[PDB]
Each structure stands twice: as structure tokens, then as C-alpha cells.
Copies of this chain bind each other. A is one copy, B any other.
Amino acid sequence: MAITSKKIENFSDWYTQVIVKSELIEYYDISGCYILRPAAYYIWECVQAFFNKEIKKLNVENSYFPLFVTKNKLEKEKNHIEGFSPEVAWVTKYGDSNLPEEIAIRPTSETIMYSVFPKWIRSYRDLPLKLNQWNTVVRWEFKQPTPFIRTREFLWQEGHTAHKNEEEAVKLVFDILDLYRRWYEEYLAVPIIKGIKSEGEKFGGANFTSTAEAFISENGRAIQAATSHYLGTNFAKMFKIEFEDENEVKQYVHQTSWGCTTRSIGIMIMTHGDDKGLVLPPNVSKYKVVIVPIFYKTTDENAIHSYCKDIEKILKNAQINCVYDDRASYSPGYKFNHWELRGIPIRIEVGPKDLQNNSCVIVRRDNNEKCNVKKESVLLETQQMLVDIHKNLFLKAKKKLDDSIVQVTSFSEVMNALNKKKMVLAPWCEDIATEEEIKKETQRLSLTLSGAMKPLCIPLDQPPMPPNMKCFWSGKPAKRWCLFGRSY
């Protein structure tokens, strides 16, 4: 019924409380895995629809290749309940693993896909080839887990393409990346930084890895929001995926992979959450409005029930989903808290002092600003409000993000900024040994999760690099500006 830990002071328990007490998830008694209740799934359905539309515009074609992961990752269920997640249940009776270990570690159809691709691509006429699929996997949950965020249970999407060029493929990679950005912004009202990964933090089979980075202020921790890989000809060469060009001479396809996950949900939740509880941006909230009757002393309760039902009509007629809470058992206060907690964007309160006034009151979930509004304005005003709540969420989020970055030019400044829950943006020479040197040094200077500072991304929107500038670590000429930060 209420939230005991304050977000800014006991973050982890705050998150726990919020997601279980907001009817988002439900834990099974066994395996520590959770049910995505309608409340949670709805979000996924929204972003899923969005993505599908947008990649259809990109001539991506949905499909399904059976997922493979090495047997070893599924043993904990095999011993505990003798059952596996249905999407990868075949991989046990498979026996010996195959082929490269670098991909078998993670559930994917890449192992299968790449295997059948050379038979699908023989001519240049067969390119470009653009596939997508939606996946769900669940393994025996971590001992100390964080739903959406640090968990073995996932619901995600993975795309794969093959091209005649590198230009084609890379363009595509960044197109997808910007779709992930829109994914987070237009729908989860979450801001992210577009960037390229350090050579040590990139995917090994990748030429380069582009990422969307998000940042949790209350933790002072960054977390990867989405990834788009330019794979190059690595796996073409590896799997003999060649085609015959227009001049009719055999050449290697250029591939890309990309994927975003239910992680996004958790990230959203961490971005907008109150001590009051859940705050959904309206696009991903099943009900946009809850309608509450306020009355204690005896009155025409019927008159109100009707007035309210009239508002509910006005709105459900605009395909704006409402819930009217006329429960007799609970105080108007109880209700307030109950739906504030479940993350409903707008609450309309109806009072006897509003039926003779023919108005009502509307309250925003995000800033709890109240206002008085006439009945005929209700629909309009509610709409404009549902837009504004979103813009506002995205703003406060963005500001927090912007405030969490410190531009340093030397290592002196680093640790300070770190302990203030900030990430730094620093002139790096991007040489590799320095990654591990910086990890080890920053781990050694700090007071679950790690304290070592990792290179997160080289952001696409680069600050000018002075001709002089040295790497804040090596003292070599700095190559580019890089985000370092503690992370998930």
C-alpha cells in the first residue's frame, strides 16, 4: 500500500518496493523469476509496435530462427526443475556445442543464421538481406538480482543484416541506433547519449559497436540502453558468406547486428520514479486518467456517480483509457495514493463543490500540480496535459543527465567527480592498456556492483579536440573525447 524506502537514500530497496507494489511484476514462489503483469507488458507492446513499424519502413523483415546458447548456461534449471525456457529447450538434447564459443555464450540465432546464410545469398540480387526477430528467454534467476536490470530473464529484439557495401551497412547501423534513441525518448521519455564503444568494451566479432548510453543519477551509474554492431566481413569470412557482384566476381557481404531489451523498462522506471512510486509517461500507461469521487458528509452520491461517469464517457469516446474508482470501501486519500503509486499520469477529482460549479480538478502525476477545469474543456485540457507530462518528464530527465557529466582534462579531477555520482568526459588517446590501467586505478581509490571506472562510449557529438590536447591518463596525444563512468 505504501513505499517505505526513499529513492534518493535507499535506492535499491526503493526500486524493489516500487516494482512489486505497483503491480508491474510478480515473483513465482520458485526459481526467483517474475511474471510481467499486464501493467509491465503493455510498455513492451508499445515500444515493440513502434520498432516494428519503423523497421518495416526500413524493409526489415521479421522472422524467427531458433535461439542457441551453450548447454552450460542452462544447467541451473536442469538440476532444479528439469525444465528449460521453451525458446531454447532444444539445445540440451543437442549435446556438443558448436561452433565458436564467442557467440554460444549468449542465446542467439546467429549460430544458426550464419550457418544457413551462404545458401540464401548467392547473387548481389539477394542483397541487402534484413531480418528481425522478437525473443524471450528465462534462466534460473541470479542469487542477488535486479529485475529488468541485472537478471537472467529477458524479452528483447535482435536484428541482423547483410549488405553489398560497408557504406550501406554502416548507414543502416546508425539508422537503427537513432531508432533506439526515438524508442527511449518518444516512448519512455528517456534521454540517451549516442556513442561508439572502446576497443576493449566493443563486441569481439564486431568491427565497431555503437551504443545508446543511459545514466542513473541516484546510483551515479551508467547502463547500456541499446547496441548496433557493424560486424564487417568478419563472419562472412568465417562462414563463407559470399555473393557474386554485378561484375560477377565473388565478394564478402558486410553485416550488422542490433538489439534492445526489456532493460529499457527498468531504465525508464529508474529515471522517473517518485518516493510516491511509479511514474509512467502516458504513451506506456494503460490508463491515462483515474477518476476519483470526493465526499464524506452525506450528499447526492448518485449525482456524482453520474457526473463522473459522464467524464469517463467524454474520455473513453476519445479513445483515452480511464478508470473510475467508485469503491465504497476506501477513502479518497487511499485511492489517491493507490493510483499515484500505480503510476497513472492524470487524476481527475470530482467534488460536490464542482458539480454545482460544473467543473472538476485535474492533478499531474509528475509534479502533482492541480488545476480547476470546466466540464466541456475536460477532454481538450486532459489531452494537452498528457502531452505536457511527457515533455516535462523528458526535460527533468535530460537536465539530470546533463548535470551528471563533468568535462575533465586530467586525472586529478576524476575521482572527485566520481564520488559525486557523476560520470566524466575526458580527452583519451583510446589506447587499450590504458583501459585496464584506468579500471585498476579507479578501483583502488574507491570506498554487488564495482567501483572501477570504465570507458562507456566515445559519443558521436564530439567536442572540438585542440591540437595540443593530451590524454588525461597516458600523456599521449588525445584522440577523442570519451565518457568514463561507473556502470551496470
Contact = CB atoms under 8 A, between A and B. Distances in A.
A135 interface: yes
A433 B133 CA distance: 48
A321 to B, nearest CB: 10
Nearest to A65: B35
Interface string A75-90: 0010001111111111
A2 interface: no
Contacts of A137: 86-87, 89
Contacts of A41: 61-64, 133
Contacts of A139: 86, 89-90
B63 A93 contact: no
- This chain: copies in complex: 2
Contacts of A42: 61-62
* Prevailing SS type, chain A contact patch: mixed
A45 interface: yes
Contacts of A62: 38, 41-42, 45
Contacts of A105: none
A327 interface: yes
Contacts of A26: 116, 119
A107 to B, nearest CB: 10
Interface string A269-302: 0000000000000000010000000000000000
Interface in A83-107: 83-94
Nearest to A39: B61
A35 B91 CA distance: 11
A136 B64 contact: yes
Chain A interface size band reads 35 or more
A87 B119 CA distance: 28
Contact of A91 (B29, B38, B286): B29
A66 interface: yes
Given A26-B119, A35-B116, A64-B41, A70 B93 contact: no
Contacts of A92: 28-30
Contacts of A153: 66, 90
A130 to B, nearest CB: 9
B85 A68 contact: yes
A36 interface: yes
A92 to B, nearest CB: 5
A45 B55 CA distance: 14
A115 B45 CA distance: 25
Given A28-B112, A64-B41, A125-B327, A136 B91 contact: no
A88 B28 CA distance: 14
Contacts of A31: 68, 90-91, 93-94
Nearest to A61: B38
A30 B107 CA distance: 15
A381 B64 CA distance: 35
Interface of A: 26, 28-31, 33-38, 41-42, 45, 61-71, 77, 81-94, 112, 115-116, 119, 125, 131, 133, 135-141, 153, 155, 286, 327
Given A35-B64, A69-B89, A71-B89, 12 more contacts: A28-B112, A28-B115, A28-B116, A36-B63, A38-B61, A68-B138, A69-B84, A86-B86, A87-B136, A87-B137, A90-B139, A125-B327
The 6 closest A-B pairs by CB, nearest first: A83-B89, A68-B83, A38-B61, A86-B137, A81-B89, A28-B91
12 contacts: A30-B93, A31-B91, A31-B93, A31-B94, A35-B63, A38-B62, A41-B64, A64-B136, A82-B89, A86-B136, A86-B137, A87-B138
